Amino acid sequence: GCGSRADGGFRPSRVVVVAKTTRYEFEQQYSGLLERHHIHTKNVEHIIDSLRNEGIEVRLVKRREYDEETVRWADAVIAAGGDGTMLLAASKVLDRLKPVIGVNTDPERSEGHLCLPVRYTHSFPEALQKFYRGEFRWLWRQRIRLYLEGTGINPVPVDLHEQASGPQLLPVRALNEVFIGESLSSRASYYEISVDDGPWEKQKSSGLNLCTGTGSKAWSFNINRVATQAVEDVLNIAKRQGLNRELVEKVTNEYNESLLYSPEEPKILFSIREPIARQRCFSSKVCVRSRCWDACMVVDGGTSFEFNDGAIASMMINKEDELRTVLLEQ
Amino acid sequence: GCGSRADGGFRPSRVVVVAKTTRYEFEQQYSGLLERHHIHTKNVEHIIDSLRNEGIEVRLVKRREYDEETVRWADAVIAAGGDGTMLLAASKVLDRLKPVIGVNTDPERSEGHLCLPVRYTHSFPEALQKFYRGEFRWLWRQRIRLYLEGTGINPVPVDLHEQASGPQLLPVRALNEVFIGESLSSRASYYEISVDDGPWEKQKSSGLNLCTGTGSKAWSFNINRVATQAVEDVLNIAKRQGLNRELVEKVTNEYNESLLYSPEEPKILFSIREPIARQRCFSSKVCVRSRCWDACMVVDGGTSFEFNDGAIASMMINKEDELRTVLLEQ
Numbered sequence: 001g002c003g004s005r006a007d008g009g010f011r012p013s014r015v016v017v018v019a020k021t022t023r024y025e026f027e028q029q030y031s032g033l034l035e036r037h038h039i040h041t042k043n044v045e046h047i048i049d050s051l052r053n054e055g056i057e058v059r060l061v062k063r064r065e066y067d068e069e070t071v072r073w074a075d076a077v078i079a080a081g082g083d084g085t086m087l088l089a090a091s092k093v094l095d096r097l098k099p100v101i102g103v104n105t106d107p108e109r110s111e112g113h114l115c116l117p118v119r120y121t122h123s124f125p126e127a128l129q130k131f132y133r134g135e136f137r138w139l140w141r142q143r144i145r146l147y148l149e150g151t152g153i154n155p156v157p158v159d160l161h162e163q164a165s166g167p168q169l170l171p172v173r174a175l176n177e178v179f180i181g182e183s184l185s186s187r188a189s190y191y192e193i194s195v196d197d198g199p200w201e202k203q204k205s206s207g208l209n210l211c212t213g214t215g216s217k218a219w220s221f222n223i224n225r226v227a228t229q230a231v232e233d234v235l236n237i238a239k240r241q242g243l244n245r246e247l248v249e250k251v252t253n254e255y256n257e258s259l260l261y262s263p264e265e266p267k268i269l270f271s272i273r274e275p276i277a278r279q280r281c282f283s284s285k286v287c288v289r290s291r292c293w294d295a296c297m298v299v300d301g302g303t304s305f306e307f308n309d310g311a312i313a314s315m316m317i318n319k320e321d322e323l324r325t326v327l328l329e330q
Numbered sequence: 331g332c333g334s335r336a337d338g339g340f341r342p343s344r345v346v347v348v349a350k351t352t353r354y355e356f357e358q359q360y361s362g363l364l365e366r367h368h369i370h371t372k373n374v375e376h377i378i379d380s381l382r383n384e385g386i387e388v389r390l391v392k393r394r395e396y397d398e399e400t401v402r403w404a405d406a407v408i409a410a411g412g413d414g415t416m417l418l419a420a421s422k423v424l425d426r427l428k429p430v431i432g433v434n435t436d437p438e439r440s441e442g443h444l445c446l447p448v449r450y451t452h453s454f455p456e457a458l459q460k461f462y463r464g465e466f467r468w469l470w471r472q473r474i475r476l477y478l479e480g481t482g483i484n485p486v487p488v489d490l491h492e493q494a495s496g497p498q499l500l501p502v503r504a505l506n507e508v509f510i511g512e513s514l515s516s517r518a519s520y521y522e523i524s525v526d527d528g529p530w531e532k533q534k535s536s537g538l539n540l541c542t543g544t545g546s547k548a549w550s551f552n553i554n555r556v557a558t559q560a561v562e563d564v565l566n567i568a569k570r571q572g573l574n575r576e577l578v579e580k581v582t583n584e585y586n587e588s589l590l591y592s593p594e595e596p597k598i599l600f601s602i603r604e605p606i607a608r609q610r611c612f613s614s615k616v617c618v619r620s621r622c623w624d625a626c627m628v629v630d631g632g633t634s635f636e637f638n639d640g641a642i643a644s645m646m647i648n649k650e651d652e653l654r655t656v657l658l659e660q
């Protein structure tokens with residue numbers, strides 16, 4: 001039931017297409033990796049010809065060439081690849097009126113929950129028609145804003161895909177989540193946390209995940225979901241201390257469902273990842289004081305910010321940061 | 331009920347003490363960090379004088395100075411610090427006859443499950459007496475062996491605390507666990523896994539944890555434990571689809587207990603950490619084929635090995651690798 005129907009048609013003049021970098025292409029900077037490159041490149045051409053046949057002026061760019069100037073030149077952004085390319089596309093759109101549309105250029109292998117339905121990959125003119133008639137819904141997805149302050153801070157971001165101070169609004173917003181933790185996988189993180197302006201709790205864990213409704217289907221879900229076997233063990237323990245397989249798969253699914261919420265809900269699902277002796281809650285604001293030696297904040301898996309002892313971060317949710325996305329019929 | 335009573339007294343001639351590097355000392359390479367340094371240093375002196383008053387020849391070393399030659403010179407190793415210093419001490423002992431003893435030099439802040447009971451920190455002569463009389467149990471803790479093969483491998487280890495090929499036995503054994511995953515916290519890992527010589531399963535997750543019975547109380551427990559609130563939700567869902575607080579805390583505890591097993595059991599608890607659409611099982615052998623760009627194997631949190639595409643790792647459990655530890659009365 002999400003979104004709202006378009007008031008009129010969507011008939012843009014200028015569109016930037018940002019295209020995924022294929023596994024084959026990553027080497028330039030065995031048979032099947034070339035195939036998946038042809039499939040993708042073929043679908044990007046299909047997208048570009050469709051735009052051009054309608055009369056939309058089109059710029060094709062890769063990650064290295066997708067900058068703020070092209071976003072401002074464009075009336076709309078089209079991410080051609082997968083959910084990651086949606087994440088790339090959105091990282092440089094800060095205007096809540098500029099639409100961002102994702103097309104899964106490889107349906108049979110990288111099914112992407114942030115892109116149009118797979119039918120519109122091979123039938124993309126049909127999507128452009130529906131846009132023209134106004135037969136679609138706008139969906140404004142909430143995103144997370146990040147402020148950084150403290151001593152020895154560094155607000156300059158690092159693109160992971162290419163290898164005393166007042167509060168500072170960081171240059172990206174999180175569509176999926178903000179991950180806060182030590183740069184290195186195997187080293188535990190130490191920080192003080194304040195949820196909704198509450199008291200500071202000292203915490204030692206393997207990181208923090210702060211996600212949106214959009215992001216709740218992503219890392220947060222795998223951080224927090226329970227397996228059908230665990231539910232079965234819990235019940236057997238309860239049945240033994242105090243059961244069909246369809247009845248067990250249903251409690252699991254109902255439980256795992258409660259981990260998911262609407263991408264329109266302006267709330268943060270805050271998960272403490274593997275705490276060491278509240279692990280998860282909803283919130284409007286979270287503030288983290290870093291107490292670690294070599295930590296980072298990673299936004300949507302791609303933009304990293306240094307986050308070392310004496311840095312303070314505050315994440316919250318602002319209407320200005322909504323991402324204008326679309327919902328198509330089928 | 332673990333261990334076996336000492337056949338005779340333990341009266342060593344030469345002991346190496348490896349001492350924790352305090353938070354204060356890490357800077358040399360605010361009031362309270364100096365205090366915790368005094369507490370530790372005071373307890374190290376207490377340990378050393380106790381050894382020397384008995385007549386044991388003693389060498390005191392820090393991490394940088396704890397090498398294989400000192401281990402061979404010593405009849406026994408004493409780790410003075412916490413469970414991490416136990417992990418350091420054991421990383422360079424490969425002889426299943428050489429005892430390794432841990433003393434918590436800071437009981438009131440870094441309680442360590444691998445060290446003697448806290449009483450023997452301030453009453454260490456009493457521990458030496460019990461060793462002399464033979465009033466203690468030997469506990470042989472199982473450890474994990476790591477073999478590495480494939481193309482482009484690098485078997486040289488890296489100490490994290492200081493910043494085509496045939497199978498190759500790596501120079502350390504895991505007392506807690508082997509962690510396998512991408513070097514960077516926020517990047518998912520891709521590998522093929524083979525448990526007990528079974529078929530290869532392609533897997534995408536946030537890493538693999540392969541722990542011992544000793545290690546099952548450590549990272550694995552926080553990877554796999556369920557919170558009392560989750561159990562409560564599961565039951566409420568089941569009660570609603572199909573409950574006291576002491577009855578809920580008991581199912582949680584019984585469930586979390588099943589995640590723990592004896593440090594004498596020669597089995598690996600294999601956990602897939604946050605799998606992306608078996609998550610956990612016991613095994614004798616696990617083989618991992620790396621399919622990631624910048625991955626590592628981290629042993630016991632401190633020794634790291636490069637583990638990139640085309641590397642194959644096999645972990646198993648060998649009697650030769652048991653760590654000779656002690657159990658004291660109280």
Ligand SMILES: NC(=O)c1ccc[n+]([C@@H]2O[C@H](COP(=O)([O-])OP(=O)(O)OC[C@H]3O[C@@H](n4cnc5c(N)ncnc54)[C@H](O)[C@@H]3O)[C@@H](O)[C@H]2O)c1
Binds near residue numbers: 114214216299604
């Ligand atoms: N589940 C985990 O263990 C884990 C680990 C690291 C990152 N991630 C997620 O990956 C994201 C970045 O992805 P990437 O560009 O590196 O691609 P990727 O292909 O390396 O991994 C992302 C995977 O999650 C899916 N995904 C991404 N956003 C989603 C969303 N909002 N809802 C549902 N599924 C979604 C993608 O389709 C893909 O399957 C991060 O924002 C984070 O949420 C998950």
Ligand SMILES: NC(=O)c1ccc[n+]([C@@H]2O[C@H](COP(=O)([O-])OP(=O)(O)OC[C@H]3O[C@@H](n4cnc5c(N)ncnc54)[C@H](O)[C@@H]3O)[C@@H](O)[C@H]2O)c1
Binds near residue numbers: 546
């Ligand atoms: N729980 C997590 O999220 C997490 C994250 C990273 C590492 N670790 C564990 O930390 C270990 C290395 O510790 P470190 O030297 O860096 O010290 P540390 O103080 O940085 O963290 C280790 C913590 O776990 C405890 N611990 C360690 N081994 C244990 C065991 N066998 N049983 C029970 N508790 C144990 C320690 O007492 C300490 O509380 C790794 O082997 C790994 O198991 C846990």
